């Protein structure tokens, strides 16, 4: 039998951002977790999501991703 769990957008069947039957994002949901996810949507570009060093701008959401990018 297939292991469906590795394909989930949301691991929990109770996550409102996903459909419990498929564990995939519902229509209009962009994400179901992350520092740059809010109510199933990507946070606005430029939203501060990780505090940096004093001379630097803080890490900011891109508007296209649910994670907070780390500068490499």
UniProtKB/Swiss-Prot annotation:
It comes from the Eukaryota. Disulfide bonds join 8-23, 10-18, 17-40, 31-37, 36-61, 49-68. Residues 5-72 form the Disintegrin domain. Inhibits platelet aggregation induced by ADP, thrombin, platelet-activating factor and collagen. Acts by inhibiting fibrinogen interaction with platelet receptors alpha-IIb/beta-3 (ITGA2B/ITGB3). This is Disintegrin rhodostomin. It comes from Calloselasma rhodostoma. The lineage of its organism: Eukaryota, Metazoa, Chordata, Craniata, Vertebrata. The chain holds residues 408 to 475 of 478 of the full protein.
């Amino acid at each position: 039998e297939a292991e469906f769990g590795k394909e989930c957008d949301c691991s929990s069947p109770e996550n409102p951002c996903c459909d419990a039957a498929t564990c995939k994002l519902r229509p209009g949901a962009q994400c179901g977790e992350g520092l740059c996810c809010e109510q199933c949507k990507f946070s606005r570009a430029g939203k501060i999501c990780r505090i940096a060093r004093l001379d630097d701008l803080d890490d900011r959401c891109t508007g296209q991703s649910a994670d907070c990018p780390r500068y490499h």
